[PDB]
Amino acid sequence: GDTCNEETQNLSTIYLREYQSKVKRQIFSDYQSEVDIYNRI
């Protein structure tokens, strides 16, 4: 009933949230700069 359409919107948003994190893992990782831990410690 209302559960069928809420459930649909809810399984759709979880599928979307997960694909958006893969996209952020691609584009934000270009900004990740490694630290020389021995020098800073």
């Binding site: 994190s21 952020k24 630290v35 410690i41």
Partner: protein, 103 residues
């Protein structure tokens, strides 16, 4: 050496595995004196910290505390899900000992 985070966490006294399977909800980072730490929370209400390097920290752990804070910052920014946490339960907030993520 251990093959999984549960096997590794079992080798230590005062640890417990938390299955999180969720992304980090908030990230806090401090450079204030004697509180150079990171705090993370989840929508479950759980809070965990990476502790200030200290007296009970052997020196190989010092380069690993630094790595863990870098891993947590980029995990938070990319919304990657953390699968399990191995934590020391004798600290408030409980302290992170190991992290695993999959897929």
């Amino acid at each position: 050496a251990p093959q999984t985070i549960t096997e590794l966490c079992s080798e230590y006294r005062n640890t417990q595995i938390y299955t999180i399977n969720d992304k980090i909800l908030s990230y806090t980072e401090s450079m204030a004196g004697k509180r150079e730490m990171v705090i993370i929370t989840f929508k479950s209400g759980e809070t965990f910290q990476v502790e200030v390097p200290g007296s009970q920290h052997i020196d190989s752990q010092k380069k690993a505390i630094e790595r863990m804070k870098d891993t947590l910052r980029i995990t938070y920014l990319t919304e990657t899900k953390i699968d399990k946490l191995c934590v020391w339960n004798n600290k408030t907030p409980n302290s992170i000992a190991a992290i695993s993520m999959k897929n």
